[PDB]
Design a protein around this ligand. Sequence first.
Ligand SMILES: Nc1ccn([C@@H]2O[C@H](COP(=O)(O)OP(=O)(O)OP(=O)(O)O)[C@@H](O)[C@H]2O)c(=O)n1
Ligand SMILES: [Mn+2]
Ligand SMILES: [Mn+2]
Ligand SMILES: [Mn+2]
Length: 437
Amino acid sequence: MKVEEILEKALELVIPDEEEVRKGREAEEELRRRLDELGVEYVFVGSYARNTWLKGSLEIDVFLLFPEEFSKEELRERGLEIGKAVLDSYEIRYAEHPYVHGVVKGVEVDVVPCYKLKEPKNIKSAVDRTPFHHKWLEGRIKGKENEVRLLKGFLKANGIYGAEYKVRGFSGYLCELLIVFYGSFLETVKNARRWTRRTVIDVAKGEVRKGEEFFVVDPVDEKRNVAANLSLDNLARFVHLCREFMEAPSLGFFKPKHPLEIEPERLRKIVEERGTAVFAVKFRKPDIVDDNLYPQLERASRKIFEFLERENFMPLRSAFKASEEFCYLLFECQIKEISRVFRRMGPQFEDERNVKKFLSRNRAFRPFIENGRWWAFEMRKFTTPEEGVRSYASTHWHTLGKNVGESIREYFEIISGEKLFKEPVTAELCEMMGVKD
RNA sequence: GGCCGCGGCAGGUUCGAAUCCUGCCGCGAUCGCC
Ligand SMILES: Nc1ccn([C@@H]2O[C@H](COP(=O)(O)OP(=O)(O)OP(=O)(O)O)[C@@H](O)[C@H]2O)c(=O)n1
Ligand SMILES: [Mn+2]
Ligand SMILES: [Mn+2]
Ligand SMILES: [Mn+2]
C-alpha cells in the first residue's frame, strides 16, 4: 500500500495468467500450421508478437506480405482469400483497408494484407507501416514488455486506451513508443505531467522539442504524427491522472470503474434539481463500422449543439450513445422555454435606402430606434429546444453526416422527460452531467 | 468508405453583408485522421 508497492500488485491484473498464455501459444502453433501449408509470406505483429498484450484481452495480429506489382484489387482479393481459408469462423467488415476478423481455437485473429517493402521511405498505403513497426520495436522493447502492460492497463482502465474514434486516446503503438523513450511506466508518468498541447516528442533522436500541436514523431516516420488521433480532451485527462497518481498513488487507477447505475427515478430527481431541459434525438442505427459511425455522431451532435447555441437555448453539454438498434444524441439546455418574440437588428438611421426596405417588411409589432439604428420585434417559429431541434433535424438532415443524416431523414423523434430515462442512455447522461457516486 | 483541415465557385438567411447557414468542385501524396 506504499507508493512503489502498488505497481507490483497491479501486475496481477495487467499480466496474462498461465491459463491464457497456453491458449495463445496453442493458437499460434495452429495458425503457422495453416499458413505454412499455403506457402505464403507472412509476419506476426501486434502485441502478441512482442508479448505486451493485456490480461483477459488476447488478440493476434497477422500481416500478409505481397509483391509491389500486385494491384490494389489483387492484394485485397488474395489477402481476404487467405484469411478466410485460415480462420475457423470469419467475418469480413472493414473501412480504410481490407482485413479478416475471425476465431482460431477460441482466440481472435486479424489477417491484414500489405506490401513487403525495403526502407520505409516510399510507402503506398497506410497499412504498410506495421511491418517496419515490428522490426524497429521488437529489438528495443524486449524485456520491457511488462512496463508496457502497465501503461496500457493504466489507460484502458480509465477508458482512454482506444485509438479508434470511439475513444480518441493513445494507440498501443504509442504506448510502446513511450516505454522505450522513458524506460518505464513510473518514469513515463512523471514527464507526462508537464506535457502541453505544443509538446513535440521525437523518439528517434531521443529529443523533445516544441511545435504547433502535440506531436509524437514515428521513429519510422519523421513527418507522420503517432498521436494524431489523440483528442486534446483525453490528452488533458491523462496529464491530470498522472498528477493524481504521483501525488497520491492508488490501486484504483488500474481498476475498471463502476457502470454508474442510476435508477430511472433518481435520474429524474437529478434533472429536476438541475432544472435544465434534457432531451434526446433517437433514430435507427446505420449498419456501418464504428470508425465510420462515431465520427458522424460527433458531427451530428455538434451541428445540433451549434444550432442550440445560436438559437439562444444556451446548451451546456452534448453526449451520444450507440446501442445495437438505435442511436441517441443527448443534449442539456439551460433554457426550457424561450419567448415568442425577439429583436432583429436593422440599418442605421442615415441611409434611407436600406431603412425603407427594412420597414417595408410586414411585422406583427411596430419597429423602433435604439442608439441611432433601427430595430424590430420578430416572431420565432418555435419556443422550446425540442421544437427547435426537430425543426432543424427535419430540414438540415443532410449535413448531419452521410449515413447518420439519411437515417434521420427517414424517421427520428425527440425523447424527453420520463420517456427518456427509460432508455439505455443513463450512464451517458450521468457522465454528461458529472454526477458523482 | 466515413470524418477532419484548407482552397474555389453557386446559392440562402438578411435592410445589406466581411460575420452566419447550406449545395457543388478541387487540394491533402510518408497515401491528413481510422
Ligand atoms: N485491422 C487492422 C489493421 C492494422 N493493424 C495494424 O497492426 C498494428 C498493431 O495493431 P493493434 O492491435 O491495434 O495494436 P496493439 O499493439 O496490438 O494493441 P492491443 O494490445 O490492444 O492488441 C498496427 O500498426 C496496425 O496498423 C491491425 O492490428 N488491425
Ligand atoms: Mn492487437
Ligand atoms: Mn477513400
Ligand atoms: Mn435574398
